[PDB]
Design brief:
This is part of a larger assembly, with chains A (112 residues) and B (161 residues).
Chain A: H1 2-6, H2 12-25, H3 32-44, H4 48-64, H5 69-79, H6 86-100, H7 103-111
Chain B: H1 8-19, H2 26-37, H3 45-60, H4 68-85, H5 90-101, H6 105-121, H7 125-139, H8 144-156
Helix pairs in contact in B: 2-4, 5-7
The chains are: A mainly alpha (112), B mainly alpha (161).
PDB class: transport protein
Keywords: copi, coatomer, coated vesicles, Transport protein
Entry title: The structure of the COPI coat linkage IV
Chain lengths: 112, 161
């Protein structure tokens, strides 16, 4: 309900809060395809900023992986990628950051 | 124009004609600009450029742009193209300056466009000055646009360690 409605019940501000929370929660509650499905959408919206949250939430999530995620988790960041300079940069950088640590290690430091 | 035997001169006479444009009507003007761009094998250029600069001054003036603004953007496009081909010069520096003066996004977008481009183009030298120029501009200024500007530039970085 939240997901859907909020989508078409708007307000960016809400998203900030919820994002943050969601950010922690991920794969302890599974339903991956859906959740992904959502996540993509959330990003769908413009705003470098709106887009950005899906990646950040993801870090706790990614790290944990779910009912299918690690392989693919690795595949995805690749599949979804962006320019728009500082938006480019965000993709690049997260990557670059990613680039910079053994992704397993990477996850551990950053997450905390 | 498909008199592709296309004589030198003719291209050249344009400016004269173009002068008339100062008695505006953008829409007409606009048609001109496209038209204009074409002839230049990166030449009859300077005289023009100069003239452009004249335009530029003219553009300053006191203005109450409403139509001409548009023109400016266009001009810049028209202008942009040339440069690609060309080796260009001080004139260009001036845009940079000019741009600093200005206050609306579309230009920033162009600028940015330039950011991109230039990032590709790198013969560099100019940039550095400009970067300086910019440094001034920057010091000299505040805004989201700027704020954004900083970001990329910052991103860019080099010397004066």
């Amino acid at each position: 309900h939240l997901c859907e409605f909020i989508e078409d019940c708007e307000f960016t501000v809400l998203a900030t809060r919820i994002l943050h929370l969601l950010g922690q929660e991920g794969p302890k509650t599974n339903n991956p395809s859906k959740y992904i499905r959502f996540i993509y959408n959330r990003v769908v919206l413009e705003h470098e900023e709106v887009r950005a949250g899906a990646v950040s939430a993801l870090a706790k999530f990614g790290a944990q992986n779910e009912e299918m995620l690690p392989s693919i988790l690795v595949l995805l960041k690749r599949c979804v990628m962006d320019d728009d300079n500082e938006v480019r940069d965000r993709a690049t950088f997260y990557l670059n950051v990613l680039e910079q640590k053994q992704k397993a290690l990477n996850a551990g430091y950053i997450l905390n | 124009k498909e008199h592709p035997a296309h004589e030198r001169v003719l291209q050249d006479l344009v400016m004269d004609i173009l002068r008339v444009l100062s008695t505006p009507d953008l829409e007409v003007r606009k048609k001109t600009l496209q038209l204009a761009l074409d002839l230049v094998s990166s030449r009859n250029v300077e005289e023009l450029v100069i003239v452009l600069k004249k335009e530029v001054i003219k553009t300053n003036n006191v203005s109450e742009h409403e139509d001409t603004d548009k023109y400016r953007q266009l001009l810049v496009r028209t202008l942009h193209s040339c440069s690609v081909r060309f080796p260009d010069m001080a004139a260009n520096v001036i845009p940079v300056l000019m741009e600093f003066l200005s206050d609306s996004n579309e230009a920033a977008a162009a600028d940015v466009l330039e950011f991109v481009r230039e990032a590709i183009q790198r013969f560099d030298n100019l940039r550095m000055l400009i970067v300086e120029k910019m440094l001034e501009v920057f010091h000299a200024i505040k805004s989201v646009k700027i704020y954004r500007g900083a970001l990329w530039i910052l991103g860019e970085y080099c010397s004066t360690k």
